[PDB]
């Protein structure tokens, strides 16, 4: 599984990212990949809020959330998709752990 993790505080600010799995995956361009994926996650979905905002609102009320697939474009024109799941964790202050899973197919 090609993925990366984020941690957000309860304002939704990202306070860390873990790219260890991407760096072990043997492909170049993972920095561009992570930026592009995050930016796609945070983009307004037409008239609806971004998946980031939808997941944040849901996870803070109900403790878990999941996005459908969203697409983004690497610098060389390569089209990928990802989806995101997250979880409110009570350890310290409470934080939101998110996993972002890449589909290359």
């Amino acid at each position: 599984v090609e993925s990366f993790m984020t941690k957000q505080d309860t304002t939704g600010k990202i306070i860390s990212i873990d790219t260890s799995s991407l760096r072990a995956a043997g492909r170049t361009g993972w920095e561009d990949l992570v930026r592009k994926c995050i930016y796609a996650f945070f983009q307004p979905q037409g008239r609806e809020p971004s998946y980031a905002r939808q997941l944040f609102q849901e996870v803070m009320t109900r403790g878990t959330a999941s996005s459908p697939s969203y697409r983004f474009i690497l610098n060389d024109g390569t089209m990928l998709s990802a989806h995101t799941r997250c979880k409110l964790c009570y350890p310290m202050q409470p934080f939101i752990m998110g996993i972002h899973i890449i589909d290359r197919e």
Binding site: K13, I14, S16, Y39, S50, A52
Partner: peptide, 14 residues
Amino acid sequence: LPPTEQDLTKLLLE
């Protein structure tokens, strides 16, 4: 509030 380019540069080096 989305993360800016500088927000991500910081997270990715830290």
